[PDB]
Coordinates of all heavy atoms in Angstrom, one line a residue:
Chain A
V2 N 136.9 -114.4 -122.0 CA 137.5 -113.2 -121.3 C 138.0 -112.3 -122.3 O 138.8 -112.6 -123.2 CB 138.6 -113.7 -120.3 CG1 139.3 -112.4 -119.7 CG2 138.2 -114.6 -119.3
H43 N 136.7 -134.2 -122.9 CA 136.6 -133.9 -121.5 C 135.2 -133.3 -121.1 O 134.9 -133.2 -119.9 CB 137.7 -133.1 -121.0 CG 137.6 -131.7 -121.4 ND1 138.3 -131.1 -122.4 CD2 136.9 -130.7 -120.7 CE1 138.0 -129.8 -122.4 NE2 137.2 -129.5 -121.4
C44 N 134.5 -132.8 -122.1 CA 133.1 -132.3 -121.8 C 132.2 -133.4 -121.4 O 131.2 -133.2 -120.7 CB 132.6 -131.8 -123.2 SG 133.2 -130.1 -123.4
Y47 N 135.4 -137.5 -117.8 CA 136.5 -136.9 -117.0 C 136.5 -137.5 -115.5 O 136.0 -136.8 -114.6 CB 136.6 -135.4 -117.0 CG 137.9 -134.9 -116.5 CD1 139.0 -135.2 -117.2 CD2 137.9 -134.2 -115.3 CE1 140.3 -134.8 -116.7 CE2 139.2 -133.7 -114.8 CZ 140.3 -134.0 -115.5 OH 141.6 -133.7 -115.0
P49 N 138.5 -138.1 -113.0 CA 139.0 -137.4 -111.9 C 137.9 -136.5 -111.2 O 138.1 -136.1 -110.1 CB 140.1 -136.5 -112.4 CG 140.5 -137.0 -113.8 CD 139.3 -137.8 -114.2
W50 N 136.9 -136.1 -111.9 CA 135.8 -135.3 -111.4 C 134.5 -136.0 -111.3 O 133.5 -135.4 -111.1 CB 135.6 -134.0 -112.1 CG 136.7 -133.1 -112.0 CD1 137.8 -133.2 -111.2 CD2 136.9 -131.9 -112.8 NE1 138.6 -132.1 -111.4 CE2 138.1 -131.3 -112.4 CE3 136.1 -131.3 -113.8 CZ2 138.5 -130.1 -112.9 CZ3 136.5 -130.1 -114.4 CH2 137.7 -129.5 -113.9
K52 N 133.1 -137.2 -113.9 CA 132.3 -136.9 -115.0 C 132.3 -138.0 -116.1 O 133.3 -138.3 -116.7 CB 132.8 -135.6 -115.6 CG 131.8 -135.0 -116.7 CD 132.5 -133.9 -117.6 CE 132.5 -132.5 -117.0 NZ 133.6 -131.7 -117.6
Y90 N 142.1 -141.1 -126.2 CA 142.0 -139.9 -125.4 C 142.7 -140.0 -124.0 O 142.5 -140.9 -123.2 CB 140.5 -139.6 -125.1 CG 140.1 -138.7 -123.9 CD1 140.7 -137.4 -123.7 CD2 139.1 -139.1 -123.1 CE1 140.3 -136.6 -122.7 CE2 138.6 -138.3 -122.0 CZ 139.2 -137.0 -121.9 OH 138.8 -136.2 -120.8
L96 N 145.3 -134.8 -121.3 CA 144.2 -134.4 -122.3 C 144.6 -134.6 -123.7 O 144.0 -134.0 -124.6 CB 143.6 -133.0 -122.0 CG 142.8 -132.9 -120.8 CD1 141.9 -131.6 -120.8 CD2 141.9 -134.1 -120.5
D99 N 142.0 -134.8 -127.2 CA 140.7 -134.4 -126.5 C 139.6 -134.1 -127.5 O 139.4 -133.0 -128.0 CB 141.0 -133.2 -125.6 CG 139.9 -132.8 -124.7 OD1 138.9 -133.5 -124.5 OD2 140.0 -131.6 -124.3
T171 N 154.4 -124.1 -119.5 CA 153.7 -125.0 -118.6 C 154.6 -126.0 -118.2 O 155.5 -126.4 -118.9 CB 152.5 -125.6 -119.4 OG1 151.7 -126.5 -118.5 CG2 152.8 -126.2 -120.7
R172 N 154.1 -126.8 -117.2 CA 154.8 -127.9 -116.8 C 154.2 -129.2 -117.3 O 154.7 -130.3 -117.1 CB 154.8 -128.0 -115.3 CG 154.7 -126.7 -114.5 CD 154.2 -126.9 -113.1 NE 155.1 -127.8 -112.4 CZ 155.5 -127.6 -111.1 NH1 155.0 -126.6 -110.4 NH2 156.3 -128.5 -110.6
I173 N 153.0 -129.1 -118.0 CA 152.4 -130.2 -118.6 C 153.1 -130.6 -119.9 O 153.6 -129.8 -120.6 CB 150.8 -129.9 -118.8 CG1 150.2 -129.9 -117.5 CG2 150.2 -131.0 -119.7 CD1 149.5 -128.5 -117.2
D193 N 140.8 -114.9 -123.8 CA 141.0 -116.3 -123.7 C 139.6 -117.0 -123.5 O 138.6 -116.3 -123.3 CB 141.9 -116.6 -122.4 CG 142.3 -118.0 -122.2 OD1 142.3 -118.8 -123.2 OD2 142.8 -118.3 -121.1
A194 N 139.6 -118.3 -123.7 CA 138.5 -119.1 -123.4 C 138.4 -119.2 -121.9 O 139.4 -118.9 -121.2 CB 138.6 -120.5 -124.0
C195 N 137.4 -119.7 -121.4 CA 137.3 -119.9 -119.9 C 136.2 -120.9 -119.6 O 135.7 -121.6 -120.5 CB 136.9 -118.5 -119.2 SG 137.3 -118.4 -117.4
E196 N 135.9 -121.1 -118.3 CA 134.9 -122.1 -117.9 C 133.6 -121.9 -118.7 O 133.1 -120.8 -118.9 CB 134.6 -122.0 -116.4 CG 135.0 -123.3 -115.7 CD 134.0 -124.4 -116.2 OE1 132.9 -124.5 -115.5 OE2 134.3 -125.2 -117.2
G197 N 133.1 -123.0 -119.3 CA 131.9 -123.1 -120.1 C 132.1 -123.0 -121.6 O 131.3 -123.3 -122.4
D198 N 133.3 -122.5 -122.0 CA 133.8 -122.4 -123.4 C 134.3 -123.8 -124.0 O 134.3 -124.0 -125.2 CB 134.7 -121.3 -123.6 CG 134.1 -119.9 -123.4 OD1 133.0 -119.7 -123.9 OD2 134.8 -119.1 -122.7
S199 N 134.8 -124.7 -123.1 CA 135.4 -126.0 -123.5 C 134.5 -126.6 -124.6 O 133.3 -126.6 -124.4 CB 135.3 -126.9 -122.3 OG 136.5 -127.1 -121.6
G200 N 135.2 -127.3 -125.5 CA 134.5 -128.0 -126.5 C 134.1 -127.2 -127.7 O 133.8 -127.7 -128.7
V219 N 138.5 -126.1 -128.2 CA 138.9 -125.6 -126.9 C 139.2 -126.7 -125.9 O 138.2 -127.5 -125.6 CB 137.9 -124.5 -126.3 CG1 138.4 -124.0 -124.9 CG2 137.6 -123.4 -127.2
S220 N 140.4 -126.9 -125.4 CA 140.7 -128.1 -124.6 C 141.0 -127.8 -123.2 O 140.4 -128.3 -122.3 CB 141.7 -129.0 -125.3 OG 142.0 -130.2 -124.5
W221 N 142.1 -127.0 -122.9 CA 142.6 -126.7 -121.6 C 143.4 -125.5 -121.5 O 143.9 -124.9 -122.5 CB 143.3 -128.0 -120.9 CG 144.6 -128.5 -121.6 CD1 144.7 -129.3 -122.7 CD2 146.0 -128.0 -121.3 NE1 146.0 -129.5 -123.1 CE2 146.8 -128.7 -122.3 CE3 146.5 -127.2 -120.4 CZ2 148.2 -128.5 -122.3 CZ3 147.9 -127.0 -120.4 CH2 148.7 -127.6 -121.3
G222 N 143.4 -125.0 -120.3 CA 144.2 -123.8 -120.0 C 144.4 -123.7 -118.5 O 143.5 -124.2 -117.8
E223 N 145.4 -123.1 -118.0 CA 145.6 -122.8 -116.6 C 145.1 -121.5 -116.2 O 145.7 -120.4 -116.5 CB 147.1 -123.0 -116.2 CG 147.8 -124.2 -117.0 CD 149.3 -124.2 -117.1 OE1 150.0 -124.5 -116.1 OE2 149.8 -123.8 -118.2
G224 N 143.9 -121.5 -115.7 CA 143.2 -120.2 -115.4 C 142.6 -119.6 -116.7 O 142.6 -120.2 -117.8
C225 N 142.3 -118.3 -116.6 CA 141.7 -117.7 -117.8 C 142.4 -116.3 -118.0 O 142.3 -115.5 -117.1 CB 140.2 -117.4 -117.7 SG 139.3 -118.9 -117.2
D226 N 142.9 -116.2 -119.1 CA 143.5 -114.9 -119.5 C 144.6 -114.5 -118.5 O 144.8 -113.3 -118.3 CB 142.4 -113.8 -119.6 CG 142.9 -112.7 -120.5 OD1 143.7 -113.0 -121.4 OD2 142.6 -111.5 -120.1
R227 N 145.4 -115.5 -118.1 CA 146.5 -115.2 -117.2 C 147.8 -114.8 -118.1 O 148.0 -115.3 -119.1 CB 146.9 -116.4 -116.3 CG 145.8 -117.0 -115.5 CD 146.2 -117.1 -114.0 NE 145.4 -118.0 -113.1 CZ 145.9 -119.1 -112.6 NH1 147.1 -119.5 -112.8 NH2 145.1 -119.8 -111.8
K230 N 150.4 -117.3 -119.8 CA 149.7 -118.5 -120.0 C 149.0 -118.5 -121.4 O 148.7 -117.4 -121.9 CB 148.8 -118.8 -118.9 CG 149.6 -119.1 -117.6 CD 150.2 -120.5 -117.5 CE 151.2 -120.7 -116.3 NZ 151.5 -122.2 -116.1
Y231 N 148.7 -119.6 -121.9 CA 148.0 -119.7 -123.2 C 146.9 -120.7 -123.2 O 146.8 -121.6 -122.3 CB 149.0 -120.1 -124.3 CG 150.1 -119.1 -124.3 CD1 151.3 -119.4 -123.7 CD2 149.9 -117.9 -124.9 CE1 152.3 -118.4 -123.7 CE2 150.9 -116.9 -124.9 CZ 152.1 -117.2 -124.3 OH 153.0 -116.2 -124.2
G232 N 146.1 -120.7 -124.2 CA 145.1 -121.7 -124.3 C 145.6 -122.8 -125.2 O 146.3 -122.5 -126.2
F233 N 145.3 -124.0 -124.9 CA 145.6 -125.2 -125.6 C 144.3 -125.7 -126.3 O 143.2 -125.8 -125.8 CB 146.2 -126.3 -124.7 CG 147.6 -125.8 -124.3 CD1 147.8 -124.9 -123.2 CD2 148.7 -126.2 -125.0 CE1 149.1 -124.4 -122.9 CE2 150.0 -125.7 -124.7 CZ 150.2 -124.9 -123.7
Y234 N 144.5 -126.1 -127.6 CA 143.5 -126.6 -128.4 C 143.8 -127.9 -129.0 O 144.9 -128.1 -129.4 CB 143.2 -125.6 -129.5 CG 142.8 -124.2 -129.0 CD1 143.8 -123.3 -128.5 CD2 141.5 -123.9 -128.9 CE1 143.4 -122.1 -128.0 CE2 141.1 -122.6 -128.4 CZ 142.1 -121.7 -127.9 OH 141.6 -120.5 -127.3
Ligands
LIG301 N1 141.6 -120.5 -120.2 C1 140.6 -121.5 -119.7 C2 140.2 -122.6 -120.7 C3 139.1 -123.5 -120.2 C4 139.3 -124.9 -120.7 N2 138.5 -125.9 -119.9 N3 139.0 -127.2 -119.8 C5 139.4 -127.7 -118.5 O1 139.1 -127.2 -117.5 C6 140.3 -128.9 -118.5 C7 139.4 -130.1 -118.0 C8 140.1 -130.7 -116.8 C9 141.4 -129.8 -116.5 N4 141.4 -128.8 -117.5 C10 142.2 -127.7 -117.3 O2 142.0 -126.7 -118.0 O3 142.9 -127.8 -116.3 C11 143.3 -126.9 -115.3 C12 144.8 -126.9 -115.1 C13 145.6 -127.4 -116.2 C14 147.0 -127.6 -116.0 C15 147.5 -127.2 -114.8 C16 146.7 -126.8 -113.7 C17 145.4 -126.6 -113.9

Side-chain angles (χ1 to χ4, degrees):
Chain A
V2 176
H43 81 261
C44 278
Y47 196 61
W50 291 351
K52 190 199 277 155
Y90 157 53
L96 288 194
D99 184 16
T171 180
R172 339 157 55 139
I173 291 120
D193 187 19
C195 202
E196 240 292 274
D198 294 316
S199 260
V219 183
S220 182
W221 63 278
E223 321 158 78
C225 310
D226 204 28
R227 307 234 198 110
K230 296 280 175 165
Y231 302 96
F233 289 82
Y234 297 80

